[PDB]
Amino acid sequence: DKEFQVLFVLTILTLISGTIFYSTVEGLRPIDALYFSVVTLTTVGCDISPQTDFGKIFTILYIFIGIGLVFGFIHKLAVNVQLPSILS
Amino acid sequence: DKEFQVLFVLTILTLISGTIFYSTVEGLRPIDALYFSVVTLTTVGCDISPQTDFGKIFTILYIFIGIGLVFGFIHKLAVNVQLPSILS
Amino acid sequence: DKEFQVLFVLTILTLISGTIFYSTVEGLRPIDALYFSVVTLTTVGCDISPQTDFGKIFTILYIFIGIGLVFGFIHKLAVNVQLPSILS
Amino acid sequence: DKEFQVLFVLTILTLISGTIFYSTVEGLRPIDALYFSVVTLTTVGCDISPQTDFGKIFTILYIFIGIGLVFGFIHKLAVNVQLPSILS
Ligand SMILES: [Ba+2]
Ligand SMILES: [Ba+2]
Ligand SMILES: [Rb+]
Ligand SMILES: [Rb+]
């Protein structure tokens, strides 16, 4: 699907931005930065929190911007891929 | 859009109320109070929990009143604003 | 509203059940048990986790049963109360 | 219902996969592995985070694949089963 493709690409770019930011500013390992971005944007959350004020401000903006996109991608993956394969 | 503007203003006022409350009652720094309000209303959560009973009661009420508004704002941002990707 | 009334009553009974359970089995203070039930059923989550296996099993069942009801109540409070008052 | 049964079976299989994985890779007790899978897929979250990189990668993928199915099961339970309250 085309819109699923654009949602996938935007989700990947968002997770890449989060990885880069949290590895630079918060000094996380790249895998830890990626995990934090993922559990944050899916609203799972973890015991980790940003320590710098820049990290906290960016996390607020990142949450507000990326929750909608990550969950649009999850919803489209569920409704246009997972449902037909289940029907099979 | 107008409804988007109402939702933005209400979200800002809700986060301001949360910031003021958690900086007064829970003694958090204002940036920390804002971060806690944001991660609470978006259901992300963090390792911080209110220590006073007043903080806990206010958080229960704050969750129930503000989750709907915050996620309405996120949805309207993602749909009525976050679609310039249609310029694909 | 009638269905809003039944959703409110069911949410109150669910939070009461959670308060009683987590104050007895997990030894929490009643306010702490109520706060844990609230942040759990709204998927906010907190740093607290049940220590007993009974608490963990009950929490799994409680999550699955009460997320749908708590969020039906939140959705109805947003759509049948908050929206018209906003329009005013 | 039949779709409810498919969703229940898929949810059980997903939680079983999560239990097995988190008990092997992360060394959790089986009850703890099941609890972590449940609170992760429902987006509640807990103070536990995977310690191995394999655990983190698997959790990212597990979140993205299972959130849709788990919440479809919760919705179908709450709507097609949790309405005997209509006997009001
Ligand atoms: Ba959620
Ligand atoms: Ba948490
Ligand atoms: Rb959540
Ligand atoms: Rb959470």
Numbering used by the authors:
A (entry chain A), B (entry chain B), C (entry chain A), D (entry chain B): 21 to 108
Task: Quote the passages of the study that discuss this structure, keeping the authors' original sentences.
Ionotropic glutamate receptors are cation-permeable ion channels responsible for fast excitatory signal transmission in vertebrate neurons. To this aim, we investigate calcium permeation in two cation channels: The AMPA receptor GluA2 and an AMPAR channel pore mimic that incorporates the partial selectivity filter (SF) sequence of AMPAR into a bacterial NaK channel. We used the prokaryotic NaK channel as scaffold for crystallization, as in our previous study of monovalent cations.
The X-ray structures revealed distinct ion binding profiles for monovalent and divalent cations within and around the SF. The monovalent cations bind at sites S3 and S4 in the lower part of the SF formed by TTV. This is consistent with previous X-ray analysis of a NaK C-DI mutant with monovalent cations only. While monovalent cations prefer binding sites at a narrow pore, i.e., the TTV filter in NaK C-DI48 and the QQ filter in AMPAR,23 Ca2+ ions occupy more sites along the SF with substantial presence also at the wide CDI part in both NaK C-DI and AMPAR. Indeed, in NaK C-DI calcium and barium reside stably at a single site within the wide section of the selectivity filter, which shows in contrast no occupancy by monovalent ions in the presence of divalent ions.
